[PDB]
Design a binder for this molecule. Sequence first.
Ligand SMILES: *[C@@H]1O[C@H](CO)[C@@H](O[C@@H]2O[C@H](CO)[C@@H](O[C@@H]3O[C@H](CO)[C@@H](O)[C@H](O)[C@@H]3O)[C@H](O)[C@H]2NC(C)=O)[C@H](O)[C@H]1NC(C)=O
Ligand SMILES: *[C@@H]1O[C@H](CO)[C@@H](O[C@@H]2O[C@H](CO)[C@@H](O)[C@H](O)[C@H]2NC(C)=O)[C@H](O)[C@H]1NC(C)=O
Ligand SMILES: *[C@@H]1O[C@H](CO)[C@@H](O[C@@H]2O[C@H](CO)[C@@H](O)[C@H](O)[C@H]2NC(C)=O)[C@H](O)[C@H]1NC(C)=O
Ligand SMILES: *[C@@H]1O[C@H](CO)[C@@H](O[C@@H]2O[C@H](CO)[C@@H](O)[C@H](O)[C@H]2NC(C)=O)[C@H](O)[C@H]1NC(C)=O
Ligand SMILES: *[C@@H]1O[C@H](CO)[C@@H](O)[C@H](O)[C@H]1NC(C)=O
Ligand SMILES: *[C@@H]1O[C@H](CO)[C@@H](O)[C@H](O)[C@H]1NC(C)=O
Ligand SMILES: *[C@@H]1O[C@H](CO)[C@@H](O)[C@H](O)[C@H]1NC(C)=O
Ligand SMILES: *[C@@H]1O[C@H](CO)[C@@H](O)[C@H](O)[C@H]1NC(C)=O
Ligand SMILES: *[C@@H]1O[C@H](CO)[C@@H](O)[C@H](O)[C@H]1NC(C)=O
Ligand SMILES: *[C@@H]1O[C@H](CO)[C@@H](O)[C@H](O)[C@H]1NC(C)=O
Lengths: 217, 334, 433, 49
Amino acid sequence: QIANQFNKAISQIQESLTTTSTALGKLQDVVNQNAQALNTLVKQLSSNFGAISSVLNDILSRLDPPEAEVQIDRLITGRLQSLQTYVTQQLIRAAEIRASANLAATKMSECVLGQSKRVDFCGKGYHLMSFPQAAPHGVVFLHVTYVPSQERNFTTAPAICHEGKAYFPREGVFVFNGTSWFITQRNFFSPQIITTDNTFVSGNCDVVIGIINNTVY
Amino acid sequence: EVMPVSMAKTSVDCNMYICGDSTECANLLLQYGSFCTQLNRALSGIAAEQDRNTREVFAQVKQMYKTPTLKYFGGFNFSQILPDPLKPTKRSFIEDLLFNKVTQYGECLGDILICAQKFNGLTVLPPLLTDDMIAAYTAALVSGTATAGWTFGAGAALQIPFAMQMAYRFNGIGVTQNVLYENQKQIANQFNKAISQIQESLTTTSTALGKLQDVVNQNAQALNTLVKQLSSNFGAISSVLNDILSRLDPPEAEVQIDRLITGRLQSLQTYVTQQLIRAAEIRASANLAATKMSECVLGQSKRVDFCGKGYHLMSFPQAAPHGVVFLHVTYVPS
Amino acid sequence: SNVTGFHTINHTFGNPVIPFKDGIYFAATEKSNVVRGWVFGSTMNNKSQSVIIINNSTNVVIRACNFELCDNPFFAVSKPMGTQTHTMIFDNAFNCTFEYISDAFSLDVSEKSGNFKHLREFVFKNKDGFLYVYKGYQPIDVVRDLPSGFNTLKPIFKLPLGINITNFRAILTAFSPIWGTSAAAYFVGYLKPTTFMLKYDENGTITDAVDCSQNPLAELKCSVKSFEIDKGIYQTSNFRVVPSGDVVRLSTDLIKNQCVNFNFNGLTGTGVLTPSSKRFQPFQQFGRDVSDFTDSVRDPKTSEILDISPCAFGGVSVITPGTNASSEVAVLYQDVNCTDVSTAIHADQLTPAWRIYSTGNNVFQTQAGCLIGAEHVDTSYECDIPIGAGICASYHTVKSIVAYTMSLGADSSIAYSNNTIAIPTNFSISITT
Amino acid sequence: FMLKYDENGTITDAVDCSQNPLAELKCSVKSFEIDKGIYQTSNFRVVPS
Ligand SMILES: *[C@@H]1O[C@H](CO)[C@@H](O[C@@H]2O[C@H](CO)[C@@H](O[C@@H]3O[C@H](CO)[C@@H](O)[C@H](O)[C@@H]3O)[C@H](O)[C@H]2NC(C)=O)[C@H](O)[C@H]1NC(C)=O
Ligand SMILES: *[C@@H]1O[C@H](CO)[C@@H](O[C@@H]2O[C@H](CO)[C@@H](O)[C@H](O)[C@H]2NC(C)=O)[C@H](O)[C@H]1NC(C)=O
Ligand SMILES: *[C@@H]1O[C@H](CO)[C@@H](O[C@@H]2O[C@H](CO)[C@@H](O)[C@H](O)[C@H]2NC(C)=O)[C@H](O)[C@H]1NC(C)=O
Ligand SMILES: *[C@@H]1O[C@H](CO)[C@@H](O[C@@H]2O[C@H](CO)[C@@H](O)[C@H](O)[C@H]2NC(C)=O)[C@H](O)[C@H]1NC(C)=O
Ligand SMILES: *[C@@H]1O[C@H](CO)[C@@H](O)[C@H](O)[C@H]1NC(C)=O
Ligand SMILES: *[C@@H]1O[C@H](CO)[C@@H](O)[C@H](O)[C@H]1NC(C)=O
Ligand SMILES: *[C@@H]1O[C@H](CO)[C@@H](O)[C@H](O)[C@H]1NC(C)=O
Ligand SMILES: *[C@@H]1O[C@H](CO)[C@@H](O)[C@H](O)[C@H]1NC(C)=O
Ligand SMILES: *[C@@H]1O[C@H](CO)[C@@H](O)[C@H](O)[C@H]1NC(C)=O
Ligand SMILES: *[C@@H]1O[C@H](CO)[C@@H](O)[C@H](O)[C@H]1NC(C)=O
């Protein structure tokens, strides 16, 4: 079952990466923000900033060298401050990529090279293992997780009274099958016989709330 | 623990700011190119990130669980954490205290309205999720924890009685299960008194929500400085464009108007740059709050000093203006 | 845009003085080459300079002179001969400033049967003393008016005439077996100062264009610089309300609750005047806001205390399902009262204004502003395109653009019981990226 | 001076900004009420003699 559910889940990802789009939208945004920043810096070459022309040759041709020096110096501070703006905002955006690149270095060590117990770190479900893939300007992690299903109601109890002693489960819960009492774990239903091997002995009966009269092997 | 997740989001009209309905001013702005397109792009990009920050914290669950009518779950009294339907506020009693301690530009106030505008170009936009939607996501996270626990977030929610849920979380910190069941009367009473001491602190005193107030105050100083730069002359004849037109011939009027343009257009560019730097700091705090909600409300943390001091048992979110408040229930030995 | 059609039909010989004004678009449906020439000038008299650009069936003749102009300029072709007989454009010329004659050819002048087979397209413009002449051609088969379509026009002349052209007259050809006509039509549109976005392919040929001021969808395409636009909400150019009125206290009456251009004693500006309850002292002429802006004034004739609101302004956002899905859009006028927006649209007081655009009687006011074009649906779905304050929009079957309040998630319930636990009995393996 | 106007436009209180360091602080903060802390205010110079 587990090998087949694993093999089909890879094939459904491969289908999504041929059929549809927008799964890699965060990588496209890195590309598009760099295009807008360069295109704006180019476009500022065409601005006049109040001068006679945006072309330095037309300033030299049309004007005497005293006012030519003033109109050229007017275009310098216009262009030199557009250049300083670009440098400042690339520097702010580089701080945001470090934040995302440091998180990807944490998701690779703690999740590919190990097994995470942090909930919603490394995908939804109980984390089993994880596989990196490369991308333009990024990573893609494929997280294999375990999802439990097909719930079933049971009657339960905190303790069982036997011969005047309260018996607690050491791990898991007591459930009532419908016919008899079993001890089981919470993430999968596997009922077992309540013996003294898996059951913690402590205190007397009629102390805690909800003790069931039963026998313990 | 008090964590801000979002920032007030603003917009600026250049022509109301730079010129203020002057036609000669409006013509000289074209010589600078499309500066107002890039100032509108940068401010609208910040505004969309502020909505993304709020979704990632609160909207982590797919199902909205109805608030139970039994709020006394085996001795543990949750009536000040869940909303009371008898009083028409749709907020818990602790959120009513949080919403009363954190408490010039265009803004449309009211409910579905008075849309008032100012002579500067400055305005504040409303967020996508209203306060009433935030309080519905918080009440689903509390009532999911009270009845389902871990499986509320990492899968389909499993019903479990509340005391058997506390027994598991005691087991997870290295204390065996009988310590809970033999001492439910002590633990329910210590739990109920510790909620009431928090409620007292949020009526008696202040400065617990200082980080949320700082988000508010930094946005006020940034707008008030941008307004105040309208009064500067930058070396020109007057800060008022009408007095430049009245007193001066159109050759020097064009020079003195163009002098005030670059003065105002660079004050506007400074505001945009520093809002963009401050938005990077709110993402850092809003990403941490999204980590403290999944790993600590929807689970149980083993990281020491993550999720409060002591051995972490469980944790309850509450909403706040521009932020979250986490109430961490921890175990202290003695 | 609306073009004006003229006729060469049984008794109709349309060669009047048509105004030029800016540049014209001339087109002609031909089977018999009735349209041959144009007379450009101001007064159409010999007192100033005019130019005549005619195809005289041998040459293209361009002459800019003081011409003794005919009040009826024409060529004439005999119907039983099929040849040109008359050349009556002017009688005499003097003080010529420009002349050019093209290569010789032999032109089909005879009257033809059948439908119109040829559409010639010209554009005429005045710039820096030059007459710009643009030429295109499209094969047609029509019995009637201008066909729809897209075809570029290439330049053929830059004529340094140096004359003042404010009017023009088309030169027709009279066909008689003694005057007469035969079937032809010519069209006159006017050029406007506007913005287009032109697309050039790999050969440098213009293949497509978009008029940026036709409708909100086209203004969006000019902003994005793309003919293809995906689903979303898109910020575009700001809107203003233009004032209509003048209040001066010569002296005029006091217009209230309307964006006017006011001039009180020493205070000017645009805005909306309305009475108020600010308690001025008897020595306080006007008031100010928490900033340094005048927001109120004491009326210098009757001492009424008025408020001054700004006129109106805001941003414009265009909501679209994508050009792959439809070509209808909704607009959001951000942070503005819908009374001011709707009235200023109907009275044509907004800047920008679009030609092919209407309200549609779907005006809905949210906290984000006025939403025009989308329908208000009283249910709740997942948020598709966010607008603000709990309201989203999408493209649903009712298809059309609809506006609604968001749903938060599935409405569910967990029964609480003190002795019942749920335990899963199977599992699944899932891979997430 | 820093003048305080109420809702009717009546001046109800004032602070002379050069009386003492406390009042110069109130003019800087623009508040008649000031909480506990350390507060940066205007630079000092020594005048030559
Ligand atoms: C769980 O804890 C809450 C703590 O709020 C308990 O509710 C509180 O009970 C007291 C007295 O039983 C209420 O005080 C009374 O309030 C009324 C209403 O104004 C007033 O007229 C009386 O003079 C008196 O002060 C108090 O309001 C009430 N709090 C709320 C929020 O309802 C509750 O009893 C505890 N649950 C259980 C099962 O013990
Ligand atoms: C651009 O124009 C060139 C003409 O030079 C086209 O190139 C010709 O294309 C045909 C196919 O239709 C080939 O058989 C010729 O050999 C090409 N000529 C040359 C000189 O390469 C080209 O197809 C045009 N591009 C488009 C998009 O129409
Ligand atoms: C657990 O669930 C899986 C899948 O939901 C069940 O496996 C399916 O069994 C049927 C036989 O009726 C096959 O046709 C399917 O192909 C199986 N699915 C997969 C993914 O292999 C399985 O039977 C369930 N087991 C229990 C005990 O409920
Ligand atoms: C501001 O001045 C107004 C005077 O117009 C005061 O308003 C009056 O207040 C009295 C109560 O003392 C009422 O009985 C009157 O009806 C009010 N008059 C009007 C016209 O509303 C107001 O109290 C003053 N404000 C302050 C803070 O002193
Ligand atoms: C468990 O009991 C609840 C009653 O609260 C019921 O709604 C649910 O369907 C039951 N589970 C199953 C698997 O039948
Ligand atoms: C649980 O009960 C069913 C019928 O009620 C029975 O067939 C089954 O054997 C029981 N489980 C175990 C582990 O004995
Ligand atoms: C659980 O509640 C039921 C009533 O719904 C009551 O009869 C029973 O005694 C309770 N048991 C425990 C252990 O609290
Ligand atoms: C369990 O059995 C004891 C006798 O050993 C009896 O006193 C008690 O009442 C029983 N409890 C229940 C719940 O039947
Ligand atoms: C719009 O203006 C009118 C004034 O005629 C006012 O009654 C209405 O409440 C205003 N609407 C909003 C939303 O401000
Ligand atoms: C063009 O004229 C028609 C009537 O001939 C009219 O209905 C239409 O509105 C006009 N178009 C424009 C853009 O004014």
